[PDB]
Amino acid sequence: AIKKYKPTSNGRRGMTTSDFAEITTDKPEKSLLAPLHKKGGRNNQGKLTVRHQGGGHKRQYRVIDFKRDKDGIPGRVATVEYDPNRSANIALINYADGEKRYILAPKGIQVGTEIMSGPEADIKVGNALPLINIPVGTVVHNIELKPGKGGQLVRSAGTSAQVLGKEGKYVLVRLNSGEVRMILSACRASIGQVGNEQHELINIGKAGRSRWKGIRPTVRGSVMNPNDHPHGGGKSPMSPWGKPTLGFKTRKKKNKSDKFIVRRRKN
Amino acid sequence: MKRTFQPNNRKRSKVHGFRSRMSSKNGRLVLARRRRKGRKVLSA
RNA sequence: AGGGCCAUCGCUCAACGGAUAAAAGCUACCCCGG
RNA sequence: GAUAUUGAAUGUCCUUCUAACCCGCCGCCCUUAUCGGGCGGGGAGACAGUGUCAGGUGGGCAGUUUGACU
RNA sequence: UGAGUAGCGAAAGAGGGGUGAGAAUCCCCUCCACCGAAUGCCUAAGGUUUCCUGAGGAAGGCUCGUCCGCUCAGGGUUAGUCGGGACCUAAGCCGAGGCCGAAAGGCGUAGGCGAUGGACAACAGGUUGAUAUUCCUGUACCACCUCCUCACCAUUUGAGCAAUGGGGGGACGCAGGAGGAUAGGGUAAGCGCGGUAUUGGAUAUCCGCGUCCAAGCAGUUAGGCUGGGAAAUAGGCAAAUCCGUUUCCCAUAAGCCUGAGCUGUGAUGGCGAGCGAAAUAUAGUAGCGAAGUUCCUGAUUCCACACUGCCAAGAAAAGCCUCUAGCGAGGUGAGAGGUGCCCGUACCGCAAACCGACACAGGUAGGCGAGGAGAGAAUCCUAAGGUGAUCGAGAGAACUCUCGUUAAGGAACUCGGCAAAAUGACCCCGUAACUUCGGGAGAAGGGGUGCUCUGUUAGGGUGCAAGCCCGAGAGAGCCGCAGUGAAUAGGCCCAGGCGACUGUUUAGCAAAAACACAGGUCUCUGCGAAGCCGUAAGGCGAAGUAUAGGGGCUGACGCCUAGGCGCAACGAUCUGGGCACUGUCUCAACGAGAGA
RNA sequence: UCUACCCAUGUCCAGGGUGAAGUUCAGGUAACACUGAAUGGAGGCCCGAACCCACGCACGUUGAAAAGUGCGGGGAUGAGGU
């Protein structure tokens, strides 16, 4: 679960942290890693474009499959590791054939259990198959929009969507955060809800702990010099550059994804 | 206490050099000027 | 077509001898002169 | 909103296929290549993007100004 | 003109000889003083001849000069192994085709370039006025070649070589405490000297010394492996006897790769206290040379990011080892003989050679960094080594600045105890209201500490022993005005107000009460996301996907709801009050140093 | 080439103190909670050198210095310095 530090200081009073209960190993897989260097929120012209980023701890990219083309091969689970880039915590799968790979880890997985990925695979807890085979009214995650691309949506820690309607070639889904939608036919989907869901129960505790993650300080607009902000010196909300952002929808007036949205969150 | 000049040769040749004046359009103009005036030391 | 010459109409240009088709405040962070 | 890029049949601008056009989707060769394009497949399609042209929103961005007397 | 005025840039010298036209200032000697986690040695950036010798006395040295980092003539820098290139790559930069753009130009694929990192073969002595892992004397190691000599395999059913391709490996964080060693540092054998004229010492007396390489044979603390063996293999584009995966037999010992160090050999060698010539172009050099062991202590270095723990999850590529594809008629393995290019190399690098206009009280990455007392790289005095800091003489007035001591009173001074005094070191006794239960707390307040003897105490470490080393706590005694006897080291206590806290910011202008912060809350965003930079291509957002991103307002925690309460903790915070203390003052007086 | 932020790769921080999570034996209860021991070694923790600031006072202001010196003061394993 979570563990709550004892207040033997001032900067370690409210601080809590995950207990890493489910981690089964402290080493990565040497043959599946790739380099990854920080950017600082700097464009390809060196000009700072996004603020509040830069500086942290050095990380490394861990290879993770998101297409699962290897169908008809029963493979099993070996370890469950930590991933600095994601929020969930990934799992290393070895096939009965010989090729190793990484996948997102659903909720409650146990080392040993095999995983299927074909069209004839039977719905379980860790399998992946095309949507035109999943029953109606099931929990699912790792969805994709164009058949042949790889999961992009619902890939967070604790999240889960719901598949409840199957019209002609347009099995319609309910993403997290409402917004029921009608995604395409042959795209694949993983059955189950993702793991490490306590991730929303963490006090960062102290100012310097965000800097380990890479989040620089923010200067408030109420304290500014006249000639940057309409708050500086010493109506409608505005922006460092000008944006009435208190109830102006920023989505395009007209778009291309309009024929496929049925109901929106709208709070 | 610390002054605005601390010498270095690499950072000099790499900025005010000849192969960096000649790798532009304006640097070539600088060279043509300094040859027009009559200077002795064209580029750093 | 338009133009001229002869009667004649349009303004609180009210700062009324009339700088215009039309013009607000802050700055012992401020900048330059008698 | 107007216009030109801009295809075809019922309906009176209703259904309709796609060969225009679009794909930050899949495969193969140039090729030892996450660029680019050539051929196949899937998805969408008379849309969308675009040039001109007719308004509003426009301290987003500029140029300026606001008598004399004491 | 001011004016022969202000200044002459932190600091210990004194005397005797010498050269010289000339000496406080140059050379030699003798005492004395200063640094010693540096003011010692060695090597970067930078400088560019400043380095060594022989002359010099125009100019520069805040004085002088016979001297010089100054002037004039000569001279000096040696590499197969050290650093860089005929090796590799990160951030970034360039970029054939290619995509954009009135033009000029912008972006970018293959491919390159780029150390601050990875790979990689040599050590100990000697020597010149000036170079030394480079020269010379000893012993070595690496890559490549075959006029040569041995040995063993080979005939296309094949011995050998072997990728530009596939695997393994290189390969990586922060903290903590063990262990094993060694660099270093101190007693007992031993060796050469010595006999002291100021009272005493053949003494258990005094002075100085002492070792040693890479390489090649041997064995080794430890370490990891989480055990190796067989068979079968839809994956590693093709291939595989290699790797990966699975099931069968034994395994707790066989094997595996690692290793700090230590014992022979290098060494019939070379260093070594100290003796001592010629004369030599007037040396402590040539030359000769004793002992050269055990014991105690010991790392901030090595085994080694090895082990344990933790989360913020800790570079790439090549050299290297294997696998087949593929080449093949001559090869493999020893010896013997050969080959080994370019750039840097003197000298200053905490300084008068570098950056500050100056011979400027400033600044300048890293490696070693000894002894006594000590917890220590603090503090005081010293070792190896270095230094005398570039104007002097004498007089001891007012006044300014930096120091020392003070009668009786002690904040009575002043906007304000600003400034200065008092405390501070270990060991024991003891320690409150409050509290967010951790704190507050070194709270406040009390007492002891020197030397000798019983005492090589009790006890503990090392060693078979002898012998070295660390040591409570107690008794009896001696001294002083005074025993952490010098230097370096918290002043405390009440009552309130502000901000939760650590942090950042007005350094060629003021700090908090300003900014940020963990947490709360609102709002936009279904992924070619929204939002940003660009004319656009191209990008950040993100190799992320609503527990995730962008934009606002407020600021922990706990109660009481968008109001209000609680100070506990923490401030170079704010405002009042109390003890100790003092030349701040009544009220000034002597003394020291610099200037005058 | 000074200064602000960022990217890659290195390097530095004498000594001493407090003593969290956890673990092993105890009471300890239904085991727990909870109270005791031993072991352990966390922290934008404490005192303090090197290093980094430039807060106070004095001296300097035709300064040794176009911003320094003397004596104090803050941080000092980190949101750290280079």
PDB file of C-alpha atoms (C1' of nucleotides) in Angstrom, chain E residues 235-333:
ATOM      1  C1'   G E 235      12.994 -16.559 -31.980  1.00  0.00           C
ATOM      2  C1'   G E 236      18.326 -13.845 -32.957  1.00  0.00           C
ATOM      3  C1'   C E 237      15.902 -11.512 -41.769  1.00  0.00           C
ATOM      4  C1'   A E 238      20.160 -16.125 -44.404  1.00  0.00           C
ATOM      5  C1'   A E 239      23.034 -19.882 -41.409  1.00  0.00           C
ATOM      6  C1'   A E 240      24.712 -21.813 -36.453  1.00  0.00           C
ATOM      7  C1'   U E 241      27.865 -26.695 -33.097  1.00  0.00           C
ATOM      8  C1'   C E 242      26.943 -19.535 -29.969  1.00  0.00           C
ATOM      9  C1'   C E 243      23.097 -17.287 -27.471  1.00  0.00           C
ATOM     10  C1'   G E 244      18.011 -17.486 -25.754  1.00  0.00           C
ATOM     11  C1'   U E 245      13.644 -21.118 -24.099  1.00  0.00           C
ATOM     12  C1'   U E 246      11.726 -25.979 -22.164  1.00  0.00           C
ATOM     13  C1'   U E 247      11.873 -31.060 -19.829  1.00  0.00           C
ATOM     14  C1'   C E 248      14.887 -34.931 -17.847  1.00  0.00           C
ATOM     15  C1'   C E 249      20.208 -37.122 -13.847  1.00  0.00           C
ATOM     16  C1'   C E 250      23.403 -35.688 -10.044  1.00  0.00           C
ATOM     17  C1'   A E 251      24.007 -32.084  -7.251  1.00  0.00           C
ATOM     18  C1'   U E 252      25.424 -28.133  -0.943  1.00  0.00           C
ATOM     19  C1'   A E 253      31.270 -30.129  -4.411  1.00  0.00           C
ATOM     20  C1'   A E 254      33.676 -30.210  -9.042  1.00  0.00           C
ATOM     21  C1'   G E 255      34.243 -26.342 -12.069  1.00  0.00           C
ATOM     22  C1'   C E 256      34.195 -20.694 -13.536  1.00  0.00           C
ATOM     23  C1'   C E 257      36.159 -15.905 -13.921  1.00  0.00           C
ATOM     24  C1'   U E 258      38.346 -12.667 -10.498  1.00  0.00           C
ATOM     25  C1'   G E 259      41.700 -10.879  -7.271  1.00  0.00           C
ATOM     26  C1'   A E 260      44.667  -6.570  -2.417  1.00  0.00           C
ATOM     27  C1'   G E 261      49.210  -8.795  -0.887  1.00  0.00           C
ATOM     28  C1'   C E 262      53.313 -12.226   0.699  1.00  0.00           C
ATOM     29  C1'   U E 263      58.098 -15.931  -0.192  1.00  0.00           C
ATOM     30  C1'   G E 264      62.357 -17.108  -3.653  1.00  0.00           C
ATOM     31  C1'   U E 265      64.702 -14.472  -8.469  1.00  0.00           C
ATOM     32  C1'   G E 266      65.802  -9.369 -10.720  1.00  0.00           C
ATOM     33  C1'   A E 267      70.561  -8.315  -6.819  1.00  0.00           C
ATOM     34  C1'   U E 268      78.406 -12.154  -7.475  1.00  0.00           C
ATOM     35  C1'   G E 269      74.257  -5.703  -8.614  1.00  0.00           C
ATOM     36  C1'   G E 270      73.204   0.064  -6.189  1.00  0.00           C
ATOM     37  C1'   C E 271      72.009   2.977  -2.636  1.00  0.00           C
ATOM     38  C1'   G E 272      74.007   3.897   2.131  1.00  0.00           C
ATOM     39  C1'   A E 273      76.442   7.190   8.037  1.00  0.00           C
ATOM     40  C1'   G E 274      80.890   8.946   7.080  1.00  0.00           C
ATOM     41  C1'   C E 275      86.104   9.265   5.791  1.00  0.00           C
ATOM     42  C1'   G E 276      89.105  11.817   2.096  1.00  0.00           C
ATOM     43  C1'   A E 277      92.896  13.505  -2.211  1.00  0.00           C
ATOM     44  C1'   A E 278      94.978  16.004  -6.337  1.00  0.00           C
ATOM     45  C1'   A E 279      95.365  21.028  -6.797  1.00  0.00           C
ATOM     46  C1'   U E 280      91.560  22.430 -10.319  1.00  0.00           C
ATOM     47  C1'   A E 281      90.701  26.402 -14.559  1.00  0.00           C
ATOM     48  C1'   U E 282      91.574  26.115  -6.124  1.00  0.00           C
ATOM     49  C1'   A E 283      86.272  20.361  -5.046  1.00  0.00           C
ATOM     50  C1'   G E 284      83.651  18.413   0.362  1.00  0.00           C
ATOM     51  C1'   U E 285      83.318  16.558  -6.402  1.00  0.00           C
ATOM     52  C1'   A E 286      86.800  11.964  -8.341  1.00  0.00           C
ATOM     53  C1'   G E 287      87.546   8.150  -5.156  1.00  0.00           C
ATOM     54  C1'   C E 288      86.540   4.417  -0.765  1.00  0.00           C
ATOM     55  C1'   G E 289      82.480   2.547   2.137  1.00  0.00           C
ATOM     56  C1'   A E 290      80.218  -0.228   7.931  1.00  0.00           C
ATOM     57  C1'   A E 291      75.424  -2.174   9.635  1.00  0.00           C
ATOM     58  C1'   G E 292      71.434  -2.639   6.490  1.00  0.00           C
ATOM     59  C1'   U E 293      66.937  -7.179  11.405  1.00  0.00           C
ATOM     60  C1'   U E 294      62.778  -7.957  14.629  1.00  0.00           C
ATOM     61  C1'   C E 295      58.628  -5.487  17.641  1.00  0.00           C
ATOM     62  C1'   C E 296      54.378  -1.632  18.034  1.00  0.00           C
ATOM     63  C1'   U E 297      51.000   1.607  15.661  1.00  0.00           C
ATOM     64  C1'   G E 298      48.241   2.526  10.769  1.00  0.00           C
ATOM     65  C1'   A E 299      45.229   5.143   6.957  1.00  0.00           C
ATOM     66  C1'   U E 300      41.477  10.175   3.940  1.00  0.00           C
ATOM     67  C1'   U E 301      44.854   4.585  -0.306  1.00  0.00           C
ATOM     68  C1'   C E 302      43.864  -0.586  -2.370  1.00  0.00           C
ATOM     69  C1'   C E 303      40.738  -5.594  -2.733  1.00  0.00           C
ATOM     70  C1'   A E 304      35.882  -2.763  -4.361  1.00  0.00           C
ATOM     71  C1'   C E 305      30.207  -0.108  -5.613  1.00  0.00           C
ATOM     72  C1'   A E 306      32.626  -6.253  -3.092  1.00  0.00           C
ATOM     73  C1'   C E 307      28.614  -6.510   0.759  1.00  0.00           C
ATOM     74  C1'   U E 308      24.074  -4.473   3.149  1.00  0.00           C
ATOM     75  C1'   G E 309      20.039  -0.726   2.759  1.00  0.00           C
ATOM     76  C1'   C E 310      17.270   2.795  -0.020  1.00  0.00           C
ATOM     77  C1'   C E 311      14.582   5.114  -3.761  1.00  0.00           C
ATOM     78  C1'   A E 312      14.978  10.077  -6.760  1.00  0.00           C
ATOM     79  C1'   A E 313      15.964   3.610 -10.566  1.00  0.00           C
ATOM     80  C1'   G E 314      21.390   5.441 -11.857  1.00  0.00           C
ATOM     81  C1'   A E 315      25.591   7.176 -20.593  1.00  0.00           C
ATOM     82  C1'   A E 316      27.077   5.349 -25.825  1.00  0.00           C
ATOM     83  C1'   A E 317      30.490   2.948 -29.185  1.00  0.00           C
ATOM     84  C1'   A E 318      35.024   0.427 -30.022  1.00  0.00           C
ATOM     85  C1'   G E 319      39.232  -2.834 -28.562  1.00  0.00           C
ATOM     86  C1'   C E 320      38.160  -8.264 -26.591  1.00  0.00           C
ATOM     87  C1'   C E 321      35.739 -13.642 -26.635  1.00  0.00           C
ATOM     88  C1'   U E 322      32.781 -16.812 -29.437  1.00  0.00           C
ATOM     89  C1'   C E 323      29.096 -18.456 -33.905  1.00  0.00           C
ATOM     90  C1'   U E 324      28.465 -19.858 -38.623  1.00  0.00           C
ATOM     91  C1'   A E 325      28.256 -17.504 -43.816  1.00  0.00           C
ATOM     92  C1'   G E 326      32.408 -17.167 -46.439  1.00  0.00           C
ATOM     93  C1'   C E 327      38.069 -18.163 -48.166  1.00  0.00           C
ATOM     94  C1'   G E 328      41.400 -21.851 -49.187  1.00  0.00           C
ATOM     95  C1'   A E 329      46.823 -25.707 -50.639  1.00  0.00           C
ATOM     96  C1'   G E 330      49.902 -25.031 -47.726  1.00  0.00           C
ATOM     97  C1'   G E 331      49.667 -24.089 -42.820  1.00  0.00           C
ATOM     98  C1'   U E 332      50.020 -23.703 -37.420  1.00  0.00           C
ATOM     99  C1'   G E 333      53.621 -23.578 -32.809  1.00  0.00           C
TER     100        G E 333
END
